[PDB]
Design a protein around this ligand. Sequence first.
Ligand code: HEM
Ligand SMILES: COc1ccc2nc(SCc3ncc(C)c(OC)c3C)[nH]c2c1
Length: 450
Amino acid sequence: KEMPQPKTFGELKNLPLLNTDKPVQALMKIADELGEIFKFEAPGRVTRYLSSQRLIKEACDESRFDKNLSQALKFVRDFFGDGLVTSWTHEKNWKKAHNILLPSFSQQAMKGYHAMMVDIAVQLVQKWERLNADEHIEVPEDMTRLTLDTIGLCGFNYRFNSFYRDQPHPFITSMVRALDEAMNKLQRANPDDPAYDENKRQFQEDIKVMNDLVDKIIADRKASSDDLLTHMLNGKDPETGEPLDDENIRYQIITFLIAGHETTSGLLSFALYFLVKNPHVLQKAAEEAARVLVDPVPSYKQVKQLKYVGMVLNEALRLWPTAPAFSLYAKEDTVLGGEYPLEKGDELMVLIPQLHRDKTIWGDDVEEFRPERFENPSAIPQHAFKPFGNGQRACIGQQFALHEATLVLGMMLKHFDFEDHTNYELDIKETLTLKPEGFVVKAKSKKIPL
Ligand code: HEM
Ligand SMILES: COc1ccc2nc(SCc3ncc(C)c(OC)c3C)[nH]c2c1
């Protein structure tokens, strides 16, 4: 069969469809209109967007498709380098770093992060305990303070001290502009117009901000642990017997500082959004939190008991996966779905939020927030739920993100009652990644000591 395609703009083909602040949301609306697969063309480029589990389960066959660097990741590569997220699977530094950093995410490593997660989580609970009557909380701003600080502390023993700042941390401000710039570049017909010279200068300034922080983290450790940074600096790949070089290490630090907090901040923001909009769900989560979290701070085993809270998070990831796309390329000529022939090298994009609204898998209520969908995870078919990517190139931090988010959300629900005092209208800001923008709540302390 011939694949559908959205409206075209003469010689710019589909490119002007990305001239929006919300490209993923626009792509979802295209997919709603066109179905499980469509072609998207730009001058000199083609990609195919997949939205059904039927086709995406094929794309996830690593004997047929490998991770591709999308245009997005190519642009992020300018500051992520050949770090884990932006390396090709065949590049020597992908498997080497993977092997070197994997032990940083064992169950024993996670047990050793727990105390540091608690330290930051207590700082968030205390900020909110200390607000006066009728003050409110800027949700994604505070989630970002927590998640950036958690990855800085757990991974690098470095204190961002985000909660000691009224504005976002300068590292964040530069990160958000660089990510914005990467997204904005997706739409540029003429990337080397002189009209973009100033964006290029800002982009370079933002990269310098990020990098001087990296230098500071490296300086501090050399001056001063058994954490991510220890492994980056000293660990050896069991295959080659080599450690990472200096250049790749700096890319890993930037990589992990960003991937290791931005998407988790989004997830916690979306989860709280859905909880305040679904009071019976919030009540059931609050009741588990109270039942499980019996000590003044949570223990590692207790965080593992928060099953319903785990489900809430997975359901937030189902509706709004915070890294909403990943890309694949055909390793050889092959036919997708028995209907769409692909040549070696052809690129696919998995549109995760659409996968996650596939009614053949989830039933007709796909827009409802129902954590009970995850009551028995066995029943979900393969490759239906992919907020953490696929196969050997799946998220290395998945358990880190979920443990942190489960810990923090468990504590929030134990310690406060929440009010959507503005009747907030969901507004999703895109910076490649997804977050609610302007989401505010009020939290009334239950006065449970901490
Ligand atoms: C809820 C939060 C998170 C989400 C939704 C998320 C999502 C993803 C996705 C979709 C990919 C695959 C990208 C692709 O195929 O191009 C990925 C990879 C990756 N993630 Fe996460 N992630 C989260 C949290 C984290 C955390 C906390 C860390 C680090 C501590 C992390 C580190 C990475 C790294 C290093 C990779 C590349 C792995 C590799 O290819 O070797 N992520 N993640
Ligand atoms: C049209 O092309 C697009 C648009 C938006 C997109 N958002 C993304 S999300 C891409 C992504 N995935 C995973 C991680 C770990 C990561 O670092 C935080 C990033 C930036 N990719 C896109 C591709």
